[model samples]
Target chain A: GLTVAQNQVLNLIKACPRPEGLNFQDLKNQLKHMSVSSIKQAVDFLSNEGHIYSTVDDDHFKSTD
Target chain B: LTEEQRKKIEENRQKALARRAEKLLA
Candidate 1:
């Protein structure tokens, strides 16, 4: 089961339709109530689960499906 | 801090710790 923060981050990433994907900082901005470390952990979980992947820019990530 | 705020912070911290453990295991 995903943590609440992870679920929120996952949905936010999935909501973005741009091929370029979302940036780490932008994600933090959107989830302003969350701590930076929490957001990073959520991203890590999503990446590990194969729901998201890094773009050409290391700071950006796109959803898998 | 209010009880609700403290509980929320603790929950987030716990989740963060659990995720760290998962990463280590991975």
Candidate 2:
């Protein structure tokens, strides 16, 4: 049970083309309509749920499923 | 959440699924 904003962020991550994944700035650019705090919250939720994990670098993230 | 927002979530989920399928094909 995710919030709408969380779902949006998760979907965006899952849909990202780059295998290396997206950093916070890339996510922010893609989701211009969402606030930075909202995106961070969504990222936190997704990480907690194990739907996403950090890449080699701390800033980048990719979906698990 | 509003109905519109809920609908958007469903839409996004579908899009995500579609994108995953495309990735598998690619």
TM-score to true structure, per model: 0.68, 0.66
- Model 2 chain A poorest ten-residue lDDT run: A49-58
DockQ of 1: 0.03
lDDT of 2 at A9: 90
lDDT of 1 by residue, A15-42 (tens): 8866556789889789998998899888
> Candidate 1 chain A: worst 10 consecutive residues by lDDT?
A49-58
Computed on C-alpha atoms, the DockQ of candidate 2 is 0.03
- Provide DockQ values for all models, in the order shown: 0.03, 0.03
Chain A of candidate 2 compared with the true chain A, TM-score: 0.88
- Measured with C-alpha atoms, the lDDT of residue A31 in candidate 1 is 99
Q: What is the C-alpha RMSD of each candidate to the true structure, in Å?
A: 14.3, 14.1
Local accuracy of candidate 1 as per-residue lDDT tens digits, B1-26? 45664565445445545555666578
Off by over 4 Å in 1: B1-26
